[PDB]
Structure formats: C-alpha cells, structure tokens
Amino acid sequence: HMIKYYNINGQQVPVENATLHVSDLSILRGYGIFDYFLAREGHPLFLDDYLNRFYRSAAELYLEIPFDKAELRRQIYALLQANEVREAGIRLVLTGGYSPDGYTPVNPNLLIMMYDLPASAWEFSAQGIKIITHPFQLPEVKTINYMLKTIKERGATDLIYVDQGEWIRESARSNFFLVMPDNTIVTADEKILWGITRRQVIDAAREAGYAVEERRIHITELDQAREAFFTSTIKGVMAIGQIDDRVFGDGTIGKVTQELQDLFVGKVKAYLETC
Amino acid sequence: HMIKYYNINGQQVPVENATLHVSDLSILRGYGIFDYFLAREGHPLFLDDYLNRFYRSAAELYLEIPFDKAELRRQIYALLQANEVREAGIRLVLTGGYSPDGYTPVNPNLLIMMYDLPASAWEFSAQGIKIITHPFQLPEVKTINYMLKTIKERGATDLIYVDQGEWIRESARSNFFLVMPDNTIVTADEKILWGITRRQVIDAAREAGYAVEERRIHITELDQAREAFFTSTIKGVMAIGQIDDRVFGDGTIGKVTQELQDLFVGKVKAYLETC
Ligand SMILES: [Mg+2]
Ligand SMILES: [Mg+2]
C-alpha cells in the first residue's frame, strides 16, 4: 500500500530518493523502453513472457540491459519482498541513459517501480466500453519527443484506428478482437510477437474450441460482428459495447467475451499453480 | 567551458545536483518537448523565433509552460550570466512532469541546460557530406517510448526519406534543399512553421534574387539538381556532396550553397546588431 522502495540500476532506493540526473536521454529525447505487469499471490504473472518482451524491446533500440534475465528476475522478487506486497503493478524502465554529450548512449539506466494493483484491474464489467474509430493519418519535428497520448476523450474512453479508410489498426494500448455471428474470433496479426495477454487469450479461445483468425480486419467487419473486446495487461479481457454509432448486442458483454474472461482468469490460476 | 549551473523550474541548480524524480513522465513514457539554439556574443540567436516554436511545441502536447515568454527569456539570460559564457548551446526541455499516478500530467517540469558551443557548429566544410535515401516505411507497440534515432550509419552520416517510393521526405533533424541548374532552389513546405534556420536561409536566398519553390520533391529531382544542402541550428547551411550513388558536382560545396552560407552568417550578424 505504502510503497517504500524502487530499484535503480540494481540498488534498492527509498521512493523519496529515486531520481535521475537530467543528462539521462529519456529526459532529453524520450529515448527509452518499458514494460508493465501485475503480481498476484507474491508472483509476477507470466513473468518469463514479460521479461522476454523487455529484452526484445531493448534490442529494437540497441540498448543493452545491464543484467541478464535471471538477475532481473531476482531483483523484481527482492523488490516485492522489500515492499512487503503480494499484489502489485510492476513497471520496468530502461532509459537511453546518462550521456556525456547529450546524444550518445553509453550506459542505459534501469528502473524497477512498484504500485498498488490497479483498482480497475480486471474489473470485467458487464457494461461494455464505448470507443471511436479514428484515421491512422507534428509531421515529424525533432522538438516533440512524445505513444501519441493526446486524444481529447471525444465521448469515448478509447479508440481504434482506420488506415487508408479501409483497415482497422490497433492502438498501442490494447489488442482488438471481433466475435462473428458464427463464433469465429478475429484479431490482427501485426502485434503477434508483442501481446502477452493477447497470446494467453488466443490460447484459451482455441482450447475452448473457437477458431481464431489472425489477419487484417476490414472496417466493414465492424458492421457484421456480434461482439468486440480489448485485451491488455490491466484490462484482462474487456467488453466493448459501442464503436462510434454501433452498439454491440445491447451494449453489455457478449457470450464469448464473457467465457474468455473466465478462461483468462483460469490461465492466471494455472500460471500461479506452477509458482 | 566549465558549465556550473542548469535551471530547473526557475531555480538555478549546480549541474551536479540537477535531477528529476523517476515519476517524471518523460522518464516513464518519453512524453516531452524540447528546443535548442546557440548563443553568440552573449545573446541567444533568433531567440523570439525559438521561444515561439517552444510554446507551440508545448501546445501540440497540451502542456502548459509554467512561465510566460518574457519570464523564460529572463531565465535564459540569467543562466548565461551565472555560467559566465558568451558562446553556448542552450537546450530547453519541458517534460510531461511529475505524476501521482504514473500517467496523468499535472505539472510539466521545465529544464534549461547549457553547453559549450558545438565544436562543429557552422563548420561550413568545402567537402559535402554523404547521405543515403531510405524508405519512409516496432509497428506501434506501447513498450518503445522512443525521433527514431537508430540508423546504423551505413557508410553515411545522415539520410533523407522516400515515401511511396516517389516523394522525398525530410528527417526530423534537418531541412533539405536542392539547387537546380537554373539556380531555382527547391525545398519541402511540410515543416514551414517549424524550421528556424530554414526561414532565415529562405529569406536570404530570396533577397539575393533566387527563386525558392516550396513544394513536394520527387525522387527523380535528385538526378536533375546541381546542388543539395541541409539547414539546421547546428549545421547552419551544410553542403551535401553525395546521395546514395549520386555525386553532386565534384562532391565539394556548390556555388549557390556557398553564397547561402555567407548570407546566413550575414543574417546572424544582422540579428546580433539589433541586440
Ligand atoms: Mg523511457
Ligand atoms: Mg522530454
């Protein structure tokens, strides 16, 4: 509840002293990567899958994480014990690091931060969320270091993109799924390698005997689906009740979406049992 | 030379103590804006044009700068005097700021940092730089907070983009110009509002009696130009001697590019005279 400590570069630091010098490249240029996952019953969920994503994110930016995976795993568990929590949100950050010339990475900085479990985590509400579609369309100016994060609500809480006015494109925040009248589930394949919750839910759906097609989604498919939902670390499986002017069902969670919520909780229990 | 102080949120801080808490959104998500300009003879160049850009960058991200322009101007001049320098590089940073929930901006942090004048600033070498073309083409994953900054050299020091395999698109670092056999100068208009050096050089070229067309540039135009150059804060006017397998002239600075270098220095002197 009270979080006492974070970790910077392997050292446990009181939250009140956790600071970086302003030469850090994430401060100066926004150069950095992150990951985020929950812990329950004293164990980070699907931890190996998250750590694998973190090492891959780092590689995409040519940043070397200063510890190997087993060492990072150890640091995370140590931090949970130092903060005395069994339920938490954990954020990993790897910055571009301190640079003598304000541009050259010479040593990334590694942060492990810890939070309460998000109050809304896996809310699993019966009432679906309302989102908009938006064109995928600053025209590349060096002065703006900042994922877009500038929506302005627009009676909605979230959105999905439309590209070339014909293809659905997922935001960075969540993976997007449709359930068709025939119980075919459809999702993009573009973030196949990157979605952790996405894979657990696809696996569960397949085990339940649903077909899951992974392909580009045409805008017109939104008019043909019975259900729509999001997956992410914090949401779990989250019903979407309305897109623009389209209500799905009566706006409440659909049959397959609900079953996938239960099966996701099942995948969480099964993981926890191996721990 | 020795830089003694930076400025954080209006307070002059010894460099060794200039730090931010890790809850800063630029650290966590890369959310932030910046500007950068030189000072000569104790005056930041074209300062009003830079400050105007900084306020506009901030508006694009819905961040409010905590001081008005006259106050920020005062802080910059004070910092120059505290560091006792007449020549400098000045970097402004406005982060997303400290956030109680690791996501909501509630108070951007403002940094003013100071450097030596870059050794290479306005080198104005006779030998032009060598660059490549590259497709404008991470498919939008939340985990990577980071302007691209991941080129891998590729016998070059810089690049320009090609979009739809037909249109030249400038990187974020520099504005791109061609000089045609008839002494027509051609540059994009896409960053009309954002390029500070770009405007000084366009103005100078027009005053010299050159026509400057501001429009999209077709890839094939690279095969028709006599000269090519970059403008930016640090480069001034910089000759490009080779693009991919195309040498421009004999690789050394062209006639109009050289004249534009002199005229840019003239615009700098003229500014300094008003100060
Ligand atoms: Mg970062
Ligand atoms: Mg920033």
Side-chain angles (χ1 to χ4, degrees), chain A residues 1-55 57-136 139 141-145 155-189 191-275, chain B residues 1-55 57-136 139 141-145 155-189 191-275:
Chain A
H1 221 198
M2 170 63 37
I3 300 288
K4 280 196 91 230
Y5 295 111
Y6 300 149
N7 178 317
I8 302 183
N9 287 322
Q11 307 290 323
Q12 291 182 354
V13 171
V15 166
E16 51 270 57
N17 307 316
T19 66
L20 292 175
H21 191 272
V22 291
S23 64
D24 187 278
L25 292 178
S26 66
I27 298 168
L28 297 190
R29 299 173 178 286
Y31 185 38
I33 62 131
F34 91 91
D35 222 309
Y36 185 93
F37 41 91
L38 307 183
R40 306 299 297 268
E41 293 176 21
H43 291 286
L45 300 185
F46 318 117
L47 176 56
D48 194 66
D49 294 333
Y50 290 101
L51 298 185
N52 286 341
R53 191 169 63 177
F54 188 61
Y55 282 77
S57 291
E60 282 292 295
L61 286 198
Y62 302 101
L63 297 174
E64 162 182 292
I65 294 158
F67 305 109
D68 67 13
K69 185 171 68 171
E71 184 46 24
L72 184 44
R73 188 164 183 128
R74 167 187 99 59
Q75 287 184 26
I76 293 169
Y77 271 94
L79 188 55
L80 281 170
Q81 190 68 7
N83 279 325
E84 307 181 288
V85 285
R86 292 177 88 250
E87 319 285 315
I90 303 169
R91 179 200 311 286
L92 302 182
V93 181
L94 185 74
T95 72
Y98 292 139
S99 167
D101 70 350
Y103 185 82
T104 310
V106 304
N107 188 40
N109 284 309
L110 170 77
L111 318 177
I112 310 167
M113 292 159 70
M114 200 164 283
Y115 305 90
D116 287 337
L117 195 72
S120 88
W122 312 350
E123 191 159 348
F124 293 169
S125 181
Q127 185 73 47
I129 63 155
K130 311 202 276 185
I131 75 174
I132 49 152
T133 52
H134 186 76
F136 196 49
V141 299
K142 54 189 247 289
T143 67
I144 286 165
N145 296 338
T157 52
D158 212 338
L159 70 59
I160 54 175
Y161 298 109
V162 184
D163 139 274
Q164 318 311 347
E166 67 170 343
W167 300 108
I168 289 154
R169 217 84 107 72
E170 289 179 341
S171 77
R173 288 283 306 141
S174 286
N175 299 108
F176 176 79
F177 287 81
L178 290 178
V179 190
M180 301 306 168
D182 71 352
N183 294 339
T184 300
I185 300 161
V186 177
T187 195
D189 71 333
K191 288 190 284 154
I192 190 159
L193 289 139
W194 295 96
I196 303 308
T197 307
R198 172 188 185 282
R199 208 71 213 184
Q200 299 302 316
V201 167
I202 289 176
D203 284 357
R206 285 188 182 130
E207 292 165 20
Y210 293 109
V212 176
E213 299 178 13
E214 304 181 53
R215 54 169 177 87
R216 45 170 22 188
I217 299 177
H218 199 267
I219 186 72
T220 59
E221 303 194 65
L222 291 184
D223 291 335
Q224 294 157 27
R226 183 177 73 244
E227 330 175 21
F229 64 86
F230 280 133
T231 67
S232 68
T233 285
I234 296 160
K235 296 172 159 51
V237 168
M238 176 173 279
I240 294 160
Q242 179 174 348
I243 307 184
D244 300 323
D245 63 348
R246 303 168 196 83
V247 176
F248 287 87
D250 60 8
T252 70
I253 184 162
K255 174 156 249 76
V256 171
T257 302
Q258 165 71 54
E259 186 181 3
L260 297 182
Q261 266 168 5
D262 290 334
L263 290 175
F264 175 67
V265 171
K267 288 288 181 169
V268 174
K269 263 102 138 65
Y271 175 84
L272 284 178
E273 281 164 6
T274 74
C275 287
Chain B
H1 221 198
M2 170 63 37
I3 300 288
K4 280 196 91 230
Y5 295 111
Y6 300 149
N7 178 317
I8 302 183
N9 287 322
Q11 307 290 323
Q12 291 182 354
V13 171
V15 166
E16 51 270 57
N17 307 316
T19 66
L20 292 175
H21 191 272
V22 291
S23 64
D24 187 278
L25 292 178
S26 66
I27 298 168
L28 297 190
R29 299 173 178 286
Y31 185 38
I33 62 131
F34 91 91
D35 222 309
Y36 185 93
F37 41 91
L38 307 183
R40 306 299 297 268
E41 293 176 21
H43 291 286
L45 300 185
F46 318 117
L47 176 56
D48 194 66
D49 294 333
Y50 290 101
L51 298 185
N52 286 341
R53 191 169 63 177
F54 188 61
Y55 282 77
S57 291
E60 282 292 295
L61 286 198
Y62 302 101
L63 297 174
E64 162 182 292
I65 294 158
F67 305 109
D68 67 13
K69 185 171 68 171
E71 184 46 24
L72 184 44
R73 188 164 183 128
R74 167 187 99 59
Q75 287 184 26
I76 293 169
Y77 271 94
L79 188 55
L80 281 170
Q81 190 68 7
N83 279 325
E84 307 181 288
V85 285
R86 292 177 88 250
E87 319 285 315
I90 303 169
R91 179 200 311 286
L92 302 182
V93 181
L94 185 74
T95 72
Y98 292 139
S99 167
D101 70 350
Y103 185 82
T104 310
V106 304
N107 188 40
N109 284 309
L110 170 77
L111 318 177
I112 310 167
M113 292 159 70
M114 200 164 283
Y115 305 90
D116 287 337
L117 195 72
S120 88
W122 312 350
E123 191 159 348
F124 293 169
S125 181
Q127 185 73 47
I129 63 155
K130 311 202 276 185
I131 75 174
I132 49 152
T133 52
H134 186 76
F136 196 49
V141 299
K142 54 189 247 289
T143 67
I144 286 165
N145 296 338
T157 52
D158 212 338
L159 70 59
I160 54 175
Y161 298 109
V162 184
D163 139 274
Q164 318 311 347
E166 67 170 343
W167 300 108
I168 289 154
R169 217 84 107 72
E170 289 179 341
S171 77
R173 288 283 306 141
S174 286
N175 299 108
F176 176 79
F177 287 81
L178 290 178
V179 190
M180 301 306 168
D182 71 352
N183 294 339
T184 300
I185 300 161
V186 177
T187 195
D189 71 333
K191 288 190 284 154
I192 190 159
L193 289 139
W194 295 96
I196 303 308
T197 307
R198 172 188 185 282
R199 208 71 213 184
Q200 299 302 316
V201 167
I202 289 176
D203 284 357
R206 285 188 182 130
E207 292 165 20
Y210 293 109
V212 176
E213 299 178 13
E214 304 181 53
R215 54 169 177 87
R216 45 170 22 188
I217 299 177
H218 199 267
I219 186 72
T220 59
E221 303 194 65
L222 291 184
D223 291 335
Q224 294 157 27
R226 183 177 73 244
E227 330 175 21
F229 64 86
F230 280 133
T231 67
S232 68
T233 285
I234 296 160
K235 296 172 159 51
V237 168
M238 176 173 279
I240 294 160
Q242 179 174 348
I243 307 184
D244 300 323
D245 63 348
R246 303 168 196 83
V247 176
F248 287 87
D250 60 8
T252 70
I253 184 162
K255 174 156 249 76
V256 171
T257 302
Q258 165 71 54
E259 186 181 3
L260 297 182
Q261 266 168 5
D262 290 334
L263 290 175
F264 175 67
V265 171
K267 288 288 181 169
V268 174
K269 263 102 138 65
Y271 175 84
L272 284 178
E273 281 164 6
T274 74
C275 287

